[PDB]
Amino acid sequence: EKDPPSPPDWPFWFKAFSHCHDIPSCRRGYEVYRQVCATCHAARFVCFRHMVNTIYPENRVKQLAASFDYEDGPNDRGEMFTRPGNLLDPFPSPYPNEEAARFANQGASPPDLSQQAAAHHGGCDYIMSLLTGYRDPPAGVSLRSGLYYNTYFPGGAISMPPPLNDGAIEYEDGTPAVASQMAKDVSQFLTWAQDPQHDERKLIGLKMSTAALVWLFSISVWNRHVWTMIKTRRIDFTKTVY
Amino acid sequence: FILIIKDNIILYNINDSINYLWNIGYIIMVVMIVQVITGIIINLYMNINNGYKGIIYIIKEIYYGYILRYIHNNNSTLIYVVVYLHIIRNLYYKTYYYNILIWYSGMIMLYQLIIIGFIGYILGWGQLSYWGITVIINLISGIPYLILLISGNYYITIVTIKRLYIVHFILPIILIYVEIIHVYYIHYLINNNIVEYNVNNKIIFNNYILVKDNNGIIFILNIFILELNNNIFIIADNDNLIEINILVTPIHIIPEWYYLYWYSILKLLPNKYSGLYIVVNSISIINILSEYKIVISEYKNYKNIIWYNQIIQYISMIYIGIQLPIIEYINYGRYIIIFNILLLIMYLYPKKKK
Amino acid sequence: PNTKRDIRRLGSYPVPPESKNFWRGRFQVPGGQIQQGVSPMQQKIFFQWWWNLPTRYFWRFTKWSDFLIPSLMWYTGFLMCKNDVEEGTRSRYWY
Amino acid sequence: ARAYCGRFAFMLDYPKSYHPPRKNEDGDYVDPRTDMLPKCAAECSEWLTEYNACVQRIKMRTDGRGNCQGQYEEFAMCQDHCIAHELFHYLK
Amino acid sequence: GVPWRSPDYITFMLMNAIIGSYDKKNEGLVPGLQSANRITQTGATRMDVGCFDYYTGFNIAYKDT
Amino acid sequence: HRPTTVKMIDSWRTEPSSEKPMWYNRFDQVDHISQHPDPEKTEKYPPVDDTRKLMKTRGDPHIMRGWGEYVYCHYEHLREPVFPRKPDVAKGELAAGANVTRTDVWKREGEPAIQSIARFNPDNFRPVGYAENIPCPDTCVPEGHLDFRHTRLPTWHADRRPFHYFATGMFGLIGLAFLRGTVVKVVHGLWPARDAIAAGVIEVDLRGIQPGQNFVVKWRGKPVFVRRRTQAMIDAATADDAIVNSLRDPERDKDRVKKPEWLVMLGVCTHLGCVPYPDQGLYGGYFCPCHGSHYDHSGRIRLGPAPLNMEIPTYEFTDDDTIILG
Ligand SMILES: CCCCCCCCCCCCCCCCCC(=O)OC[C@H](COP(=O)([O-])OCC(O)COP(=O)([O-])OC[C@@H](COC(=O)CCCCCCCCCCCCCCCCC)OC(=O)CCCCCCCCCCCCCCCCC)OC(=O)CCCCCCCCCCCCCCCCC
Ligand code: HEC
Ligand code: HEM
Ligand code: HEM
Ligand SMILES: COC1=C(OC)C(=O)C(CC=C(C)C)=C(C)C1=O
Ligand SMILES: COC1=C(OC)C(=O)C(CC=C(C)C)=C(C)C1=O
Ligand code: FES
């Protein structure tokens, strides 16, 4: 049959050549991830220090990390202890192994969301579409308990409960908390998490691309100059013109 | 070597009537050097232990590591674009009729390149690369015990990566040596012109041809810089950023775009070996397309109708490869393969006299 | 190298080692020629690109029009296949 | 390998202004997307008629076989393309 | 070059003298390989055969060029 | 000649040229090459004004048949038979090569044989209409084509050297900037990574410590004991500060502590690396239980197998209640 429905092309700010990741949206996205997605997903490759001076100030990131409890060790007696989190810790993981996670989601495994913004065709658009793509099942399709219909998931039936409900959280900045906002914001944040160096890449790219154009014009004038010698010569056999 | 350089760069005479399609080769050589350098530098920060996390660690922790990661991936796409365009050119101007030795040296580099690329994507430890080497290794499953020797285990594992990585490190240096054998024949067996005959219109290389060749390479750089930093064209499949799970099969086990012409051949033919064999035919028959001719002519600068239908056959097969294995695409694709053979036969056959 | 008559040299001075390839591309000019030229420093270096612009693109598009009929047959086949795939999927599935 | 394909900003039709989401009688903000659903369904009426037809054809079948997922996925893809063109204008 | 009345004309005469002249068939008391003229000496060494069968400098002056 | 090959073979499907010439086989034969008409002094066919008036061409478009790519050419490499077909030179057919030597087409009735064979020199045959058709170019730049005469600048033009060298220089200016940036960024990647820098330097918050408490911070893989020292502890080390030179490793407490209240030391026994435990030993300092080394309240070895004093790490005080290790 056909491949999973292609996600629509959403007009995110960062899609233009000279545009950045909107930090205000990324901040709200962290809140959505921490209060909704984190219950079942983990971001193993996202560390708190990645957000310092980029999404949140250093003191704020300390408070966020300290809110969680991690298992460190061993101590001098060879035992494992629990400490508050630090800026060097990865984002907390809800389940200890993949088998524990699967046992808590009807056998389904909540994928790590570290690179999910670029792990599906459509990229960021796939996250926005998926989270806003839950619908009543098509006629003739009946879904068991714990199975929900979504137009963008391959197959149509996803084991993830519809995660975004209006009023689920209160944004610190006062932005109205509606399902579509949370989607736009968590998609933004996960896109940032995938490649936190996105803005450096695009600012240095801007300086390279523009410089390369000036470079093209210099080598072109040079090419035009030296080849004039060749392209305007006159070879005569029985004729002479000066 | 300075005298050698002067003989092959400064006092090297080339016809003044060549187009910009005679600059493609210069670009291959430059982009090839860039791929070796970037590869050696990436390896400074990553090895074979766990590529998935290693690529993440390069793009997030190394300073300007993102540049190295994306250049090495995108410059591969670029290498294969320029090479494939270099072949299309050589077919159009039939630059194999009198310079077969140059053509043979090039084909050797093409074979080496096709192995270098396949194995680089398994170094990323991604789902689509894990399950695409598991499906290409099982084509030599007929030769007894050979799969086990290559893989090093009964399933693809870190053991398979530790060994292919050495082939990926070393084979490019050998390719650079064959590039010298290629430039050796080109300089002895003079290059072909846009005109079928040989004319006294040659000019030195450094003062003219290198200035023009740089205008070309800088044009391509402008475009490659835009892709390198903004991904204007999707040249890398997204499913290689999914951690390897050996239990779940990817949505589609397809190669990278520059192996979709031989992936389709393998998915269209009904017998596995027939497919393998038709993939040998594609890379081998093109090396004897002037051998059976008997007329004093190089079949050059005609309308090249057969050439055009061949270039389109390649593009159309790449399309069928992207598509899922739907029956209607398989039937139409089998006709495109039958058509390629007839077009190839037309190149090969000598002509009788009225 | 060029033909053995073309690369045959009139002079007895030895071929310099750095000019081996240069003198393997020698031609025996028959009847003579009078080659002339002017330094690019005393010429217009971009005008000829403009002067030759229309004819260059006319003679390019007239040659590339040879492939029109081939191109149309291939696109007709592309459309037929696309529609055949869609109708086949709707027939196998799609109640 | 990457989340998005880059484009010129003139090709990226970003909302030029922001219209706040409507407030309900209760006072809770109503989802802009939910309000846009009926309007975008009308824009995709042709596919919706195809889906509605399927529903009635499978309703007649006296066996239990028959689904209309294929036609629903075409309608949904259409309704969603419509939403994408105007939803971010109501979102901060 | 320079016109007759140019202040630099004598300098150009001297430069013409420095270039000098050389003929393989009239080398003089000093051979080319050991000539004080730098052009002659380096030329006489090329390929162990000499790259100048004959050469001479020239300095031609007119009223305004 | 280089390794080369010619398809000079006896074909099974294609006839030799002597049997089926592919050229328009009408030639004019002369007694001596000088008797041929001169192309340069021969009037050519009248010029035309429309491409649809250009004369017709003697070639046969369908000279070759069979499967294969289209070609029009006059010649092939095929071998000729021992007894070639006699050419009809009376009607203008060409006689050259094998069809002259291995045939008797050259024989005349009464002419001396030496004279007869002389007329069949390949130079005595030229295609009909040769002098009226071959283009005799006088230049490679035909009238109406651009050349240096038209592109030459006016004699009052300004020097174009200064700008040319600006352009070649700008190619060098931008190139060198790209090279600097490339090289500098590659070497920069060898600098300790972002994760490595973060762990390396560790700021330790001294707020909340109580006098006499010892805490351990893992810094660069090693235990770093940070102990607030009570006045009794400080005085104890000060007392041994006078008995210096009676210690295995004579060091004064002032040279081991930046602030008397705070002792930051690496907790690695100098004997065999075991980690000492605080508030243990004979000096109430740090006792390594492995082999029995006793250190004082300043970390100086006072008894045991250990040879040296516990090392003082690189650390500064950011403020009064914060240290930075590294
Ligand atoms: C979807 C469509 C699929 C279609 C599939 C089939 C397509 C077949 C297309 C080609 C055949 C068309 C029909 C041929 C009828 C018979 C022709 C004949 O007797 O020719 C004599 C005739 C000689 O006349 P000529 O004018 O004097 O030739 C002058 C030449 O310059 C010669 O220059 P030279 O004087 O230097 O001589 C060079 C020498 C060079 O010869 C050699 O290198 C000799 C060794 C190789 C060829 C012969 C042995 C091959 C292996 C046989 C099996 C061995 C089993 C051993 C088992 C041991 C167990 C203990 O060749 C010759 O002397 C002439 C023979 C040329 C080679 C081909 C001979 C076999 C023809 C049949 C080909 C296969 C058809 C398969 C059909 C399958 C079912 C549909 O040749 C020609 O007419 C010209 C050549 C035409 C054929 C070119 C073939 C190119 C190479 C590829 C062939 C396969 C292409 C398709 C493969 C597709 C899948 C991979
Ligand atoms: C917070 C808003 C989120 C986000 C951004 C995502 N989820 Fe979930 N999710 C859950 C389960 C069990 C699965 C796997 C189901 C299976 O596919 O059968 C998923 C899957 C995802 C994906 C991947 C989709 C893909 O095609 O694999 C993504 C991108 C995703 N989720 C994002 C379960 C849950 C929850 C359990 C109750 C909660 C809460 C969330 N997800 C929340 C979020
Ligand atoms: C690693 C890939 C290769 C590189 C580095 C490369 C390099 C070059 C170079 C520099 C030239 C001379 C400049 C030119 O005319 O463009 C050239 C010529 C040529 N190459 Fe390659 N090449 C490669 C791939 C191939 C392949 C795969 C083939 C054969 C299918 C091939 C066949 C030829 C031929 C026939 C010529 C001569 C063209 C003419 O007659 O001038 N090359 N190549
Ligand atoms: C013909 C030259 C080469 C080509 C065509 C080639 C191709 C590629 C490809 C396609 C990738 C996958 C990129 C990705 O994961 O998407 C890869 C990975 C890699 N290559 Fe190369 N390569 C070349 C030479 C080299 C060389 C000489 C080295 C250095 C020893 C090297 C080192 C690496 C490394 C370490 C990786 C894994 C990191 C990565 O995924 O980017 N390569 N290569
Ligand atoms: C995943 O990587 C690859 C494939 O996966 C299906 C291929 O088909 C192919 C094509 C293989 C053959 C045998 C033609 C290559 C080279 C490849 O890189
Ligand atoms: C047989 O080798 C191949 C080529 O060279 C002739 C191609 O042109 C192509 C087609 C290339 C492009 C740019 C469509 C591919 C993929 C190929 O496999
Ligand atoms: S290791 Fe401390 S006493 Fe020996």
PDB file of N, CA and C and ligand atoms in Angstrom, chain B residues 84-85 87-88 91 110 257-258 261-262 282-283 311 314-315 318, ligand 6:
ATOM      1  N   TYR B  84      28.814  10.774 -11.571  1.00  0.00           N
ATOM      2  CA  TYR B  84      27.765  10.319 -12.474  1.00  0.00           C
ATOM      3  C   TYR B  84      27.581  11.277 -13.639  1.00  0.00           C
ATOM      4  N   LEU B  85      27.796  12.572 -13.410  1.00  0.00           N
ATOM      5  CA  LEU B  85      27.725  13.547 -14.489  1.00  0.00           C
ATOM      6  C   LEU B  85      28.942  13.470 -15.390  1.00  0.00           C
ATOM      7  N   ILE B  87      30.392  10.654 -16.152  1.00  0.00           N
ATOM      8  CA  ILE B  87      30.117   9.515 -17.021  1.00  0.00           C
ATOM      9  C   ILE B  87      29.130   9.902 -18.110  1.00  0.00           C
ATOM     10  N   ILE B  88      28.064  10.611 -17.742  1.00  0.00           N
ATOM     11  CA  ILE B  88      27.083  11.042 -18.731  1.00  0.00           C
ATOM     12  C   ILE B  88      27.767  11.836 -19.832  1.00  0.00           C
ATOM     13  N   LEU B  91      29.783   9.545 -22.107  1.00  0.00           N
ATOM     14  CA  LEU B  91      28.914   8.812 -23.018  1.00  0.00           C
ATOM     15  C   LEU B  91      28.440   9.697 -24.164  1.00  0.00           C
ATOM     16  N   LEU B 110      35.326   3.922 -10.162  1.00  0.00           N
ATOM     17  CA  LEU B 110      33.896   3.821  -9.903  1.00  0.00           C
ATOM     18  C   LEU B 110      33.581   2.607  -9.043  1.00  0.00           C
ATOM     19  N   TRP B 257      20.487   7.888  -2.235  1.00  0.00           N
ATOM     20  CA  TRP B 257      19.963   8.126  -3.576  1.00  0.00           C
ATOM     21  C   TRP B 257      20.889   7.587  -4.654  1.00  0.00           C
ATOM     22  N   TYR B 258      22.180   7.467  -4.365  1.00  0.00           N
ATOM     23  CA  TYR B 258      23.156   7.115  -5.379  1.00  0.00           C
ATOM     24  C   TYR B 258      23.397   5.614  -5.438  1.00  0.00           C
ATOM     25  N   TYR B 261      19.549   3.028  -8.362  1.00  0.00           N
ATOM     26  CA  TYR B 261      19.471   2.494  -9.714  1.00  0.00           C
ATOM     27  C   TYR B 261      19.792   1.016  -9.725  1.00  0.00           C
ATOM     28  N   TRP B 262      20.566   0.570  -8.746  1.00  0.00           N
ATOM     29  CA  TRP B 262      20.936  -0.821  -8.601  1.00  0.00           C
ATOM     30  C   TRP B 262      20.127  -1.485  -7.504  1.00  0.00           C
ATOM     31  N   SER B 282      25.169  -3.919 -15.715  1.00  0.00           N
ATOM     32  CA  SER B 282      25.116  -2.469 -15.840  1.00  0.00           C
ATOM     33  C   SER B 282      26.501  -1.850 -15.737  1.00  0.00           C
ATOM     34  N   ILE B 283      27.360  -2.401 -14.875  1.00  0.00           N
ATOM     35  CA  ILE B 283      28.648  -1.773 -14.617  1.00  0.00           C
ATOM     36  C   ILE B 283      29.736  -2.354 -15.502  1.00  0.00           C
ATOM     37  N   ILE B 311      20.080   8.076 -20.511  1.00  0.00           N
ATOM     38  CA  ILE B 311      20.177   8.928 -19.330  1.00  0.00           C
ATOM     39  C   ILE B 311      18.836   8.997 -18.615  1.00  0.00           C
ATOM     40  N   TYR B 314      18.108   5.856 -16.509  1.00  0.00           N
ATOM     41  CA  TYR B 314      18.737   5.896 -15.194  1.00  0.00           C
ATOM     42  C   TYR B 314      17.878   6.666 -14.201  1.00  0.00           C
ATOM     43  N   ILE B 315      17.416   7.849 -14.600  1.00  0.00           N
ATOM     44  CA  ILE B 315      16.617   8.693 -13.719  1.00  0.00           C
ATOM     45  C   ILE B 315      15.315   7.996 -13.360  1.00  0.00           C
ATOM     46  N   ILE B 318      15.762   5.276 -10.782  1.00  0.00           N
ATOM     47  CA  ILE B 318      15.960   5.838  -9.451  1.00  0.00           C
ATOM     48  C   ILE B 318      14.619   6.204  -8.831  1.00  0.00           C
TER      49      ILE B 318
HETATM   50  C1  LIG G   6      25.326   3.147 -14.152  1.00  0.00           C
HETATM   51  O1  LIG G   6      25.855   4.214 -13.360  1.00  0.00           O
HETATM   52  C2  LIG G   6      25.031   5.283 -13.226  1.00  0.00           C
HETATM   53  C3  LIG G   6      25.185   6.454 -13.983  1.00  0.00           C
HETATM   54  O2  LIG G   6      26.219   6.625 -14.847  1.00  0.00           O
HETATM   55  C4  LIG G   6      25.962   6.231 -16.196  1.00  0.00           C
HETATM   56  C5  LIG G   6      24.184   7.450 -13.928  1.00  0.00           C
HETATM   57  O3  LIG G   6      24.220   8.366 -14.737  1.00  0.00           O
HETATM   58  C6  LIG G   6      23.188   7.406 -12.918  1.00  0.00           C
HETATM   59  C7  LIG G   6      22.103   8.459 -12.895  1.00  0.00           C
HETATM   60  C8  LIG G   6      22.528   9.762 -12.279  1.00  0.00           C
HETATM   61  C9  LIG G   6      21.785  10.845 -12.118  1.00  0.00           C
HETATM   62  C10 LIG G   6      22.368  12.158 -11.687  1.00  0.00           C
HETATM   63  C11 LIG G   6      20.298  10.842 -12.312  1.00  0.00           C
HETATM   64  C12 LIG G   6      23.294   6.458 -11.933  1.00  0.00           C
HETATM   65  C13 LIG G   6      22.586   6.557 -10.622  1.00  0.00           C
HETATM   66  C14 LIG G   6      24.046   5.249 -12.222  1.00  0.00           C
HETATM   67  O4  LIG G   6      23.921   4.245 -11.536  1.00  0.00           O
END
